[PDB]
């Protein structure tokens, strides 16, 4: 039978019933011992009221916003009897204000992205770098400094933002064992970005490509995608952004730094999913990918850094997103950003909806002596209804790693503000394994001058094939 | 039932039998007195074999090549006892090389591009100027010059190239009209690019977009078009190409102009089909095209530029391409240059395969009092079938002006070398527009700076929308 792996004794409130929401659930109710009428859900959607009323569980209709999110949540978090956990799973809603109200209330909280109260994306009077990733980032370090310890609130762990933490640990790992490095498994930060400088890893890709195919062509004027079309849109009109590598030697123009913060990243003033990447995955092979930001582009170089005694970087990994959406997503930013504005409606595929395809997403590993390493998930949509309801391929990565940080949060309670690169990776991804279909390691000699120069001159270093020279398509 | 317009006394000789050919040939039939024993189609395929013997037509196949087109094509287009007709709709083949041996043998002659034996177009010795429309299109001018008059050979004379010449001097006189101006349409050249100066004409988009959708999806390895892939795959890998207004103050570091020739255009360091430039049709409204390379976006520009006494250009208008072709197609794009190299296979949509769409080509001037004026064809997939066999929207827009520009031959006996800005428009559009669906005007207040600046900076000039600094994607 399916593993049970702890009890919950108080509320369970699930803050959004959207794709998300909807496949945690079922993972919640499969893997969690507690009376069934402690899970309360909230979401101001029809669509997800009838749903959630097909499902049996308690529902709230209401938009959780600035003004009522105190008065609204305190009262589901701290009906106890025992320990709440607050499963964010919302838009337009500030993860930091919900995550420190929990943290106030003594109820776990755990979300996967740094969401703000809605009108903070499209804030005209907002600098981009205010509207960067980073940023948002930022407030949650700070909140940590300003509260250490205290009950653990879990910030960023979906699939990616998340999962893909825990396979950068793996991957890294892996390469060792391949390339004969010797040494026993790293258990600090620091022993894990000296693993990944002494390796050679001069940068990291969260290497997607969803190749999930509806069984209707896309509508004209309508944005298709797999998982949040709001959620996505809002990432894709952030800057993009990057982790940057200390072995970088060029940026574009239109690149900007930050005066404070980790130091970790760069963002430039472009829309992340009007920006293309030449990337790579194992059945994509050789693809353009969209830079759009990501938490963990950020999360991910500022873990892996090493400083010298006077806190200056000495190594640092590149690492950023290289996205290839469904098919009708990539036509539906096309539409959008060709229009200069949203689509007048938005739709979600459905598992049912859906006539094959796969969420293959993974971390691609590079500069090291076997040139490039991609380490990840080919979870198929077959395989996800055999095995979990409710949900595409895409949607089951992210459930069952938000699944995967609350059994985490649950074994330590007690141990603040963390990211997924915070948590035990190996725990994780033991919990996560069941939902991931082929978990596989591929090297490959690709790199981003495979067959260039061409027909026309080229603004390419060949002396370092993995340049974001290289990378960025312009 | 359908008129016929002339006999034809000779052999028609059908070089290309893919899709343009294909749905050429039932209008050739239907629009021409001939005994059926005087047309003959030449095609390498074996599947345009098999697709002319259910057709009940004479058919050769061979391929067409500098070492044999004199010893196979002579004595057919000299048969007899009558002018024959040259109807070239082939790739692979050098264009002049063809017209100048049907002129010398006074065959009438008709192609819709300007294509060179094989060899030519992804020869990276040839420098890129060399290799543009701009190149290609200077020989047939310079062919006509060193031999004037004589046999009439029609070049370019498709869709786009060819039938939207036409609708430049229809949108032109329409715009004249819409003002109250009242009096003798142009009938030189000079008196043509007056009139586009007069109306304050700054540029001309070519403004297409293929909504044709497919009863299955894309898919994986497969270019998929609605016309030649071959075809579509050469030019998109030619430079970007533009005429090149007297209106535009800026122009990209990586463009460049042409030494000698008619002086009217520039070109980009960078393939056609990855660029993209911001345009507008009445169904699309705001869309992206692509700045694919046409012969049309320099014979336009040449045609309506005004000179000095010193000879020197003093109005010119931009021109070029702003194509949007079908969904499929642009996912083929996305693929051929995100793995940069070609698809394994590739595939035409049959109009079996289609379940809906249309082929929506204008021209969109703007710049004048009102704007922006979008005039061209709606032809849709379900129209197409109503009037005319064996193709997609997309082949017959192109077939019909084959058409038109046979009428017009048999109408002109000795006219020489002649382009489609050379032809008589109201004739030509008389003939062709009951395959066209609507051919309608449509005014729009939309410019390239709509919404712009937003969320991000960007180099635009905004006392002027429609410069082309504003217009391309950067
Ligand atoms: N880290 C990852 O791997 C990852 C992956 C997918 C999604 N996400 C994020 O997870 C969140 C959910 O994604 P999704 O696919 O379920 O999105 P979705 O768009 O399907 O659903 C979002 C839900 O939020 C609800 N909502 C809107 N305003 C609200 C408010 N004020 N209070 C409460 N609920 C509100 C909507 O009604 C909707 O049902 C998004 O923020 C998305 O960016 C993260
Ligand atoms: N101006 C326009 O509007 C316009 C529009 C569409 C196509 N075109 C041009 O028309 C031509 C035909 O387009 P299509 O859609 O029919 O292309 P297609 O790819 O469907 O067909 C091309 C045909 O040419 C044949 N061919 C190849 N090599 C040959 C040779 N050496 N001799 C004779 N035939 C040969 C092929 O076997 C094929 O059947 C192309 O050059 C294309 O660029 C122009
Ligand atoms: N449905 C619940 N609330 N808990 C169920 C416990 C897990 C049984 N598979
Ligand atoms: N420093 C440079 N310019 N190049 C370094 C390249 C390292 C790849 N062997
Ligand atoms: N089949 C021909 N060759 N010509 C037919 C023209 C008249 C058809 N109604």
């Given at each position: 039978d399916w593993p049970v792996y702890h009890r919950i004794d108080g509320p369970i409130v699930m803050i959004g019933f959207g794709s998300?929401?909807?496949?945690?659930l079922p993972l919640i109710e499969r893997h969690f011992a507690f009376d069934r009428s402690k899970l309360v859900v909230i979401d101001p959607s029809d669509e997800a009221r009838k749903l959630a009323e097909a499902r049996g569980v308690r529902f709230i209709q209401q938009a959780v916003t600035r003004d009522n999110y105190r008065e609204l949540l305190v009262?589901?978090?701290?009906?106890?009897?025992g320990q709440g956990f607050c499963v964010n799973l919302s838009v337009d809603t500030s993860s930091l204000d919900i995550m420190e109200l929990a943290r106030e209330n003594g109820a776990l909280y755990i979300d996967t992205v740094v969401e703000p109260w809605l009108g903070f994306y499209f804030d005209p009077d907002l600098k981009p770098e205010a509207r960067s990733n980073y940023a948002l980032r930022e407030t949650v370090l700070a909140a940590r400094r300003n509260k250490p310890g205290g009950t653990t609130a879990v910030s960023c762990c979906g699939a990616n933002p998340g999962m893909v933490s825990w396979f950068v640990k793996q991957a890294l790992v892996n390469l060792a064992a391949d390339?004969?490095?010797?040494?026993?498994?790293?258990?600090?930060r620091e022993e894990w970005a000296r693993l990944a400088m002494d390796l050679g890893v001069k940068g990291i890709h969260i290497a997607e490509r969803d190749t999930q195919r509806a069984s209707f062509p896309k509508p004209f004027?309508?944005?298709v995608n797999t998982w949040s079309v709001e959620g996505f849109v809002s990432e894709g009109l952030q800057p993009a952004?990057?982790?940057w590598g200390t072995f970088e030697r060029w940026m574009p123009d239109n690149a900007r730094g930050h005066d404070s913060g980790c130091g970790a990243g760069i963002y430039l003033?472009?829309?992340?999913?009007?920006?293309?990447?030449?990337?790579?995955?194992?059945?994509?092979?050789?693809?353009?990918?969209?830079?759009?930001?990501?938490?963990?582009?950020?999360?991910?170089?500022?873990?892996?850094?090493?400083?010298?005694?006077?806190?200056?970087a000495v190594?640092?990994?590149?690492?950023?997103?290289?996205?290839?959406p469904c098919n009708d997503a990539v036509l539906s930013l096309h539409e959008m950003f060709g229009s200069g504005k949203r689509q007048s409606d938005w739709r979600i595929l459905d598992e049912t909806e859906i006539v094959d395809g796969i969420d293959e997403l993974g971390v691609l590993l590079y500069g090291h002596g076997k040139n490039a390493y991609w380490y990840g998930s080919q979870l198929s949509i077959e395989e996800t209804r055999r095995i979990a309801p409710d949900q595409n391929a895409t949607g089951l990565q992210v459930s069952s790693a938000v699944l995967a940080g609350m059994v985490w949060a649950l074994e330590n309670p007690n141990a603040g503000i963390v990211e997924a690169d915070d948590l035990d990776?190996?725990?994780?991804?033991?919990?996560?394994?069941?939902?991931?279909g082929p978990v596989v390691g591929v090297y490959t000699d690709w790199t981003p001058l495979a067959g260039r120069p061409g027909l026309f001159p080229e603004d390419i270093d060949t002396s370092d094939p993995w340049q974001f020279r290289n990378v960025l398509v312009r």
């Open positions: 998300i929401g909807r496949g945690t009262p589901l978090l701290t009906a106890g009897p390339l004969g490095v010797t040494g026993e498994e790293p258990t600090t004027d309508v944005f952004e990057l982790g003033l472009q829309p992340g999913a009007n920006t293309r990447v030449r990337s790579w995955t194992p059945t994509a092979m050789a693809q353009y990918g969209f830079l759009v930001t990501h938490n963990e582009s950020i999360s991910i170089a500022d873990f892996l850094t090493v400083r010298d005694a006077a806190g200056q190594y640092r990994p590149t690492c950023h997103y290289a996205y290839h990776f190996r725990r994780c991804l033991e919990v996560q394994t069941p939902y991931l």
